[PDB]
Structure formats: C-alpha cells, structure tokens
Amino acid sequence: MTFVALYDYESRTETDLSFKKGERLQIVNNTEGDWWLAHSLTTGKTGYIPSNYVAP
Amino acid sequence: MTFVALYDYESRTETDLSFKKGERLQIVNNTEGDWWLAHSLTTGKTGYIPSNYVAP
C-alpha cells in the first residue's frame, strides 16, 4: 500500500513530515489511528485529535 | 455528526487538542483532510502527512 506526493509539503510542527511532490510514502499503522481536526463543544477549544480515542 | 471522548488525551504539540473523557466533539472539515503517519521511501523520514496531498 504505497502512495505518492502530489504537492510539496513543508512541516509546520515537530511531528509532521516534510516531503516533495513525487516522493513515495507508506502508511504506518499506529494505535492512535487517523487524526482529525475537531471542535470541542464542551471546552470551545479546537485542534487535531486521534480517531480511535472517540466514538459517535 | 458528533462524537465523544473515550479517554483523556493530553496535547503533545501546538496543534493537537487536549480533551477529557466524555467531552463532545464535532469534526471540522479542512482542505488538508485526515492526517496519517507515513514513512517516506524516498527520504527515510517518518511523520504525519495530510491525506489529500497524496494518491495511491
């Protein structure tokens, strides 16, 4: 299961990956799952969250 | 489309969201899409990437 970078991306944090268009990438499996941008109705705060940590 | 936090999560970076179990969350749509942990076969580097930036 291999992918390829459509555009350049420069990292904005210490945990993301910088790459250039054409690079070949493999998805790594982690226990955290996909990450989503979320808004907390409880706190009003907003930011990325690990999918597996929540349920509908 | 609302979810609820199964576990506490403490933020590790400046972009993720800290929350506590039971919090209610709403997914925000961004152009970047889901984020995945990836390994670059081209560079050997590893880190999170925005889904929409790549194709199989």
Side-chain angles (χ1 to χ4, degrees):
Chain A
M1 191 63 78
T2 287
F3 300 73
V4 50
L6 314 160
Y7 318 81
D8 296 2
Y9 172 81
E10 248 318 321
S11 60
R12 305 171 315 198
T13 70
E14 44 284 327
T15 56
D16 51 354
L17 166 64
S18 316
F19 51 84
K20 281 174 274 69
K21 163 184 157 46
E23 284 197 24
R24 307 201 310 135
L25 306 155
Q26 172 187 9
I27 301 312
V28 158
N29 297 130
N30 58 323
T31 37
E32 294 156 340
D34 289 15
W35 289 66
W36 303 327
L37 192 49
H39 178 51
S40 174
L41 301 181
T42 306
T43 68
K45 315 205 313 306
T46 313
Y48 295 95
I49 61 161
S51 307
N52 294 347
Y53 273 56
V54 305
Chain B
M1 191 63 78
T2 287
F3 300 73
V4 50
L6 314 160
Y7 318 81
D8 296 2
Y9 172 81
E10 248 318 321
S11 60
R12 305 171 315 198
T13 70
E14 44 284 327
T15 56
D16 51 354
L17 166 64
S18 316
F19 51 84
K20 281 174 274 69
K21 163 184 157 46
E23 284 197 24
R24 307 201 310 135
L25 306 155
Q26 172 187 9
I27 301 312
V28 158
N29 297 130
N30 58 323
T31 37
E32 294 156 340
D34 289 15
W35 289 66
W36 303 327
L37 192 49
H39 178 51
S40 174
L41 301 181
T42 306
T43 68
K45 315 205 313 306
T46 313
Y48 295 95
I49 61 161
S51 307
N52 294 347
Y53 273 56
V54 305

